């Protein structure tokens with residue numbers, strides 16, 4: 001669980017980050033056209049928080065894959081110069097920068 005002790009740190013930092021607003025809650029496909037069709041496996045921070053609190057993550061590698069899935073989805077659905085896309089890149093860089101510090 002010394003792997004998952006840093007996960008709580010990095011998730012709450014991503015939760016409180018300025019550019020996290022597109023990823024705090026799951027996308028509502030009733031509100032975003034095409035999202036159901038485009039994104040097969042949606043992911044967001046609150047779903048990751050949910051899962052981490054019940055301890056569903058067995059290793060820190062599973063936690064990183066959920067993080068990378070938030071940004072892979074973001075880059076698949078949103079243009080790089082979109083508001084959501086621009087935020088996704090800041091969040092993605094922040095996650096990689098922060099993850100590379102514990103490992």
Ligand SMILES: Cn1cc(C(=O)NCC2(N)CCCCC2)ccc1=O
Nearest residue numbers: 022023027031032073074077078084
């Ligand atoms: C992860 N992600 C988030 C969004 C997003 O949040 N757009 C703004 C919104 N919060 C307010 C007005 C429309 C509904 C949602 C869009 C595409 C995406 O891939």
